């Protein structure tokens, strides 16, 4: 704690325009799914959203909730590909306004709602839930309430797709032969300052405590390494504009974050899973 207040430059202070320098046009900010090896980033992001949505067994007329909708790409796929009502919620005002404006332009015969709202305040009954990349922003003290609230707002036949990043235990790493180095440790400290993760077993434990069953987990480890690689290449290609919009310090922090995380997935320290939860 510094005695004098300092309005500093944070990676969280950048505009939508900055993110458009390296995200694909749909502005997905989570692991893509290279269902075909030759897919572009945009095609793999659409394929990731389709992968999650397909696991929900959506039927015409249902209501889908996207917990943590970001810049709206998941809800666009849902509106375009299913005859369903949608609700998207986010804690980001920029993402809220962006998703609202994006989805307002999409023809639809169903209801569409975008809200600046946390899951802890959400009580609407919905038929299915998708949540991609939101869980890693939750504190572990709130995990149980999250799964309990998710269970409660679903019907008897309800299904939830939970997509989130994962870590391994030391024993599993020693088993798998993953050696964590000092530079890895220093990067984890960089994360704790600028930005602990659950293991796959933790997700099973918490979902089951809320009376969900885990029907499926699908791991996308190397898809994330490739997703982060492309993001980093795009940002580097747009370096001059990133520095003009922000600064070399902000550019460097993002580049360090993207390429460090890429290394963690490539090396096998981290993973990312889609959990199909049923009721
Ligand atoms: N407690 C909470 N309740 C609701 N949304 C939350 C939340 N904590 C984080 N979020 C939202 O979760 C999102 C994480 S970013 C992932 C965005 C999108 N699903 C994608 O795949 O690109 C952001 O929109 C963030 O505002
Ligand atoms: Cl900016």
Briefly summarize what is shown:
By secondary structure, this protein is α/β, with parallel strands linked by helices. It has eleven helices and seven strands.
The percentage of residues in β strands lies in 15-25%
> Bound small molecules, which ones?
S-adenosyl-L-homocysteine, chloride ion
Q: List the total number of helices.
A: 11
Structural class: alpha/beta
Tell me the count of domains. Answer: 1
Keywords: Cytoplasm, Lipid metabolism, Methyltransferase, S-adenosyl-L-methionine, Transferase
Subcellular location: Cytoplasm
Main location: cytoplasm
Binding site for S-adenosyl-L-methionine: 29-30, 64-72, 90-95, 119-120
Structural commentary:
Pfam families: CMAS (PF02353). It is an enzyme of class 2 (transferase). The structure is a monomer. The protein is built from eleven helices and seven strands. With 279 residues, it is of the alpha/beta class. The chain has one domain. It has a seven-stranded mixed sheet. Strand 1, helix 3 and strand 2 form a beta-alpha-beta unit. Chloride ion binds next to helix 1.
